[PDB]
Amino acid sequence: MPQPKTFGELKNLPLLNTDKPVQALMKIADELGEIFKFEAPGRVTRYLSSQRLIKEAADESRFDKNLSQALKFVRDFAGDGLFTSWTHEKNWCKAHNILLPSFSQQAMKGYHAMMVDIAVQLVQKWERLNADEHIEVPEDMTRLTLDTIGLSGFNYRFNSFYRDQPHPFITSMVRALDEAMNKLQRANPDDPAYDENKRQFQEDIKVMNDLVDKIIADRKASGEQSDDLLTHMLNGKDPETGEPLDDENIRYQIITFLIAGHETTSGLLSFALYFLVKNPHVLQKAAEEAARVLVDPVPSYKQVKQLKYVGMVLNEALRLWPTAPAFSLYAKEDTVLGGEYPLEKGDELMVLIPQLHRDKTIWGDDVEEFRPERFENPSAIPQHAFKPFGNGQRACIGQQFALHEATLVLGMMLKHFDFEDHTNYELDIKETLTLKPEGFVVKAKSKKIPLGGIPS
Ligand code: HEM
After folding, report:
1. Residue nearest atom 16 of ligand 1, based on CA coordinates
2. 32, 232, 307, 441: most buried by Cβ count inside 10 Å?
3. Cα separation of 71 and 91, whole Å?
4. Partners of 365 in beta bridges
5. Is residue 152 within 8 Å of residue 229, measured between CB atoms?
6. 271 lines ligand 1 (CB under 6 A)
7. CA distance 168 to 146
8. Dist. CA 322 → ligand 1 center (Å)
9. Which superfamily does 1-456 belong to?
10. Strands of 417-420's sheet, edge to edge?
């Protein structure tokens, strides 16, 4: 097994001493191949990059979800919510059973109207820009996605479009996540210098918790019925245990869904638009579909399902830059990987998703090209070749929510504006555990098509 350069007792750790550790690991994967060992003091991981090995790692009877060191840090504020719990923790199975029906087709049709509310707000912001102005893409996508999960899921309005800067919830989340990514790299964690980092970390957790208080308090005082994600959190009962979720876990689920429910979708929309402006025939082809399908003043649910080519664009953006670029597994038992790499019970594997998605033996030599057509026939794609939403029972529960939201929004965008890459933007990918293209700006010239009023 290959292993990258080492530095005495620090082993491989200094290689992650960089603002872009995922991109560093991709370069390492390129040089070393499908598997490499990565050591830090008191830690060893095996990074996987080939569909061949990742298909075995995908076997749930052999491997289960691991909370990598970073998810452990996130756990300080996300606790035993769905994302940061072990598969066998009481509250994983309990919350998964309780909340799974909140992401059914029937539930998706119910979120649609509120997804439209927020999308209308985005479109109105861009219609209302003066000729001198431009769009900050990731910043506006984060306004959109945070607002959509807040409203659809919790009947709460962050009102992100009524703010020139990020919402204070975003500012604290990003700082919290950034701090988690920083702790990894500290060879000397408890040194009194990092006490300022710790104080600020608690302050950020306080900010996120105070917001959760408001979401709970606003529901308590509602008067109206919502029948949404939060209803099911508050009232749903586990079939297999007879119990509802207790108050402590509910607070962790809310934090969990606010963060997991927006951040990566914001990244996806940003990348999608990035790829659209850099590939003019794809853009025109996507715009033509949006115009052809979106005939009413606001989009209906069924129409979003018909935005087939938009779905393909979104999938091809997840292919090149999956916005949650990594997930961790551990061996349940002593086992051998690919008939060649022996693992002991509890050994860690990191699935490096952007590299999985660049496996030339699966996609072809043209992996770097943006080509939505790869997704024309989705069942043509081998199992485990394409995993932007993770794996098995620990796969993304919000997958259809994200894609429906991103398809709706990108459809409306393409219907209502022409986009211009006026700075000739140079791709610069920022890492905060998740990925987004930093400083991506465009200009949107309105096609001046009237926008319908918000349903409900
Ligand atoms: C395109 C955007 C999204 C991407 C790329 C994405 C990616 C992922 C990945 C890779 C995992 C597995 C994590 C791991 O194995 O360590 C995951 C799980 C999860 N996702 Fe997403 N996700 C997205 C959107 C969403 C949305 C919109 C929601 C909520 C509405 C959501 C909620 C969750 C939750 C709660 C989990 C933990 C599931 C469990 O273990 O039971 N995600 N997601």
Report:
1. 327
2. 307
3. 17
4. none
5. yes
6. no
7. 12
8. 12
9. Cytochrome P450 (1.10.630.10)
10. 135-136, 441-446, 417-420
